[PDB]
Amino acid sequence: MASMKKKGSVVIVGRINLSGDTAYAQQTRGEEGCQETSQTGRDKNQVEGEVQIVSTATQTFLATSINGVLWTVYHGAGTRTIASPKGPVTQMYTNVDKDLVGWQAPQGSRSLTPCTCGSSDLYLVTRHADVIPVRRRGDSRGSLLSPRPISYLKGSAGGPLLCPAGHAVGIFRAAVSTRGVAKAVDFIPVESLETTM
Numbered sequence: 001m002a003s004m005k006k007k008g009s010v011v012i013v014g015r016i017n018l019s020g021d022t023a024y025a026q027q028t029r030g031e032e033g034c035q036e037t038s039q040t041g042r043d044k045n046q047v048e049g050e051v052q053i054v055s056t057a058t059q060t061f062l063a064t065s066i067n068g069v070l071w072t073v074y075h076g077a078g079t080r081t082i083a084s085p086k087g088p089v090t091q092m093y094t095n096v097d098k099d100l101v102g103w104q105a106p107q108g109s110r111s112l113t114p115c116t117c118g119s120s121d122l123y124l125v126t127r128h129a130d131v132i133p134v135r136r137r138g139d140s141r142g143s144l145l146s147p148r149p150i151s152y153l154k155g156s157a158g159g160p161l162l163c164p165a166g167h168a169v170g171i172f173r174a175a176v177s178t179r180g181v182a183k184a185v186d187f188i189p190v191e192s193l194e195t196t197m
């Protein structure tokens with residue numbers, strides 16, 4: 001028991017910048033700093049924007065701020081704390097059944113607003129900063145209008161589905177693939193987030 005360790009914190013290691021006419025990924029922490037920060041839970045880096053790239057020891061994925069909470073998928077983060085300026089921060093919300101977790105959003109981050117457009121014309125934002133058009137087909141599913149290999153969506157879970165105006169419609173959870181090609185996406189709708197809150 002003396003040698004028993006705690007799980008590391010989730011660490012913010014970059015962001016998906018959607019502020020211009022061009023989407024792009026930025027790294028803010030390399031692997032050494034990520035490892036250190038995961039162990040201490042102390043992250044003194046300034047966080048900015050809506051969509052963060054987060055990492056554990058085994059996965060790199062996305063987390064999206066909506067209504068002042070930084071949301072991601074349970075299959076990425078599990079029950080982990082997130083590193084912060086004040087030390088490790090415990091989850092505010094944990095729901096394995098929805099594949100959804102959330103922490104209070106980092107100081108200096110920006111939150112997306114939930115979509116009030118009633119829009120079914122969506123855009124998926126990926127960990128590689130691709131913006132992929134998606135037509136919504138139900139509460140929690142949409143079809144890719146432009147096929148991608150499923151490998152191209154690796155680490156996009158936790159990122160947003162946006163409406164044409166840039167409002168949050170949902171959090172990407174998982175893709176449906178045929179012969180390696182993603183044809184549809186499953187997501188956690190923003191209403192489900194609101195209910196959890």
Ligand SMILES: [Zn+2]
Pocket residue numbers: 114115116117118119163164165166167
């Ligand atoms: Zn909207």
